[PDB]
Amino acid sequence: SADWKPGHAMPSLFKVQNVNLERCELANIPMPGVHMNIAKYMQLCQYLNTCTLAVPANMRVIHFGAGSDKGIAPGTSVLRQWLPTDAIIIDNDLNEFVSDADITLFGDCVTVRVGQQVDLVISDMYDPTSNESKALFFTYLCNLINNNLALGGSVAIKITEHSWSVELYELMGKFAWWTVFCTNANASSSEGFLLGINYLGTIKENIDGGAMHANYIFWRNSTPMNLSTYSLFDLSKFQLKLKGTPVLQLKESQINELVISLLSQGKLLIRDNDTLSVSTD
Amino acid sequence: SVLSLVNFTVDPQKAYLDFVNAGGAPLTNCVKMLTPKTGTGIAISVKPESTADQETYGGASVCLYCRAHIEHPDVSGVCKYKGKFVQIPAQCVRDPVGFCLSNTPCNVCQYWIGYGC
Ligand SMILES: Nc1ncnc2c1ncn2[C@@H]1O[C@H](CSCC[C@H](N)C(=O)O)[C@@H](O)[C@H]1O
Ligand SMILES: [Zn+2]
Ligand SMILES: [Zn+2]
């Protein structure tokens, strides 16, 4: 069964452990002219199809670390295949590339100014260069979640054994639900996607970030994962559901039990309804 | 290499086609999508539309002008492919860029001429 699933998600069984941080020791992939990152992104999208993502009209999606050394952006094309046709994709990378994004911005992600709040953040950013919490682009991403993410919005942020951040783990406590998702396509890598589903702007779970990375590695060290892309054999329902999620403007004072419940079920976004301005500074 | 070469001419389309017609290696790393081969089969589409006799590519990656970072030749400044998906006949997947430079979709019918209209 597991190899027909798109990947593995960290269970609460490992979220509630208390262990020291150990080295990641994994014991363990071919593609049909198809880049591997096609399979990796499709499986990430497949898993997000089972989460309660807000899917509005004019959906606002930003994709960091979209470029490859080949000057193309396979992940962005997968997002174009997955997302509603009227979704707006902004992508970014330090290096030059060309992509099917609506807007493409070159340079450090810190040069990306999001004027308005977005609905979905995908990050595949990774810096080629004693395993302590890293800063790097994570400082930028954490500030984005605190300021430029719609209530009800979601994030999927690539981490590895050595590329990770205490602060980002703790921010997962401000979503209605969170996990780390590991694609079967890249299952022999310590890579995972930290998922925060439905941003609430308020602390729902108190998380010790450094302890939780230790729990993530303990999970990877405890969990056989076979390389596989069987989940991509049937793509008949691959596209993201056209939920027509409403976008509402509310003051903090108005956010009551009903609103939090709607945000937590993926049934509502709270943010501006303006037109998006995302530019380099 | 071929990307550098189309920067040395005022007819990048002819430059690329003469280059591949003379044995040059077609441009690689076109973004081939995985898709259910159940589409309508039109040339250029908002979502993948490949039939069982086609493969679907991300549009920017099969556009010579996009890949080589040179001016798009359209009357406006808009790629016909970028942000869309381009269906290629399965027999032509060795050089998607060359196929797109050598063919045109039906004006009424939107399928490739000689493969639809
Ligand atoms: N600070 C930063 N700002 C923007 N991109 C960064 C970054 N730090 C690392 N990256 C990008 O992280 C990327 C990891 S590889 C990305 C592969 C791509 N997602 C695909 O679809 O194939 C590299 O291209 C790297 O340049
Ligand atoms: Zn183009
Ligand atoms: Zn026709």
Automatic annotation (TrEMBL), chain A:
Protein's cellular compartments: Host cytoplasm, Host perinuclear region; Host endoplasmic reticulum-Golgi intermediate compartment; Host membrane
Domain Nidovirus-type SAM-dependent 2'-O-MTase: 1-281
Residues that bind S-adenosyl-L-methionine: N37, G75, D93, D108, C109, Y126
Residues binding S-adenosyl-L-homocysteine, per UniProt: N37, G75, D93, D108, C109, Y126
Assembly description: Interacts with nsp8 to form the replication-transcription complex (RTC): nsp12, nsp7, two subunits of nsp8, and up to two subunits of nsp13. Interacts with proofreading exoribonuclease nsp14 and 2'-O-methyltransferase nsp16; these interactions enhance nsp14 and nsp16 enzymatic activities.
Functional note: Plays a pivotal role in viral transcription by stimulating both nsp14 3'-5' exoribonuclease and nsp16 2'-O-methyltransferase activities. Therefore plays an essential role in viral mRNAs cap methylation.
Family, as annotated: Belongs to the coronaviruses polyprotein 1ab family.
Protein's recorded name: ORF1ab polyprotein
Organism of origin: Human betacoronavirus 2c (isolate EMC/2012)
Included stretch of the parent chain: 6777 to 7068 of 7078
TrEMBL record, chain B:
Domain ExoN/MTase coactivator residue range list: 1-117
Function, in words: Plays a role in the initial induction of autophagosomes from host endoplasmic reticulum. Later, limits the expansion of these phagosomes that are no longer able to deliver viral components to lysosomes.
Family from the record: Belongs to the coronaviruses polyprotein 1ab family.
Paired cysteines (S-S): C106-C117
Residues of the full protein shown: 4249 to 4365 of 4391
Gene that this polypeptide is encoded by: orf1ab
Record protein name field: ORF1a
Species: Human betacoronavirus 2c (isolate EMC/2012) (HCoV-EMC)
Residues noted as binding Zn(2+) 2 in the record, renumbered to the chain: C63, C66, H72, C79
Annotated binding of Zn(2+) 3, by residue: C106, C109, C117
Subcellular location: Host cytoplasm, Host perinuclear region; Host membrane
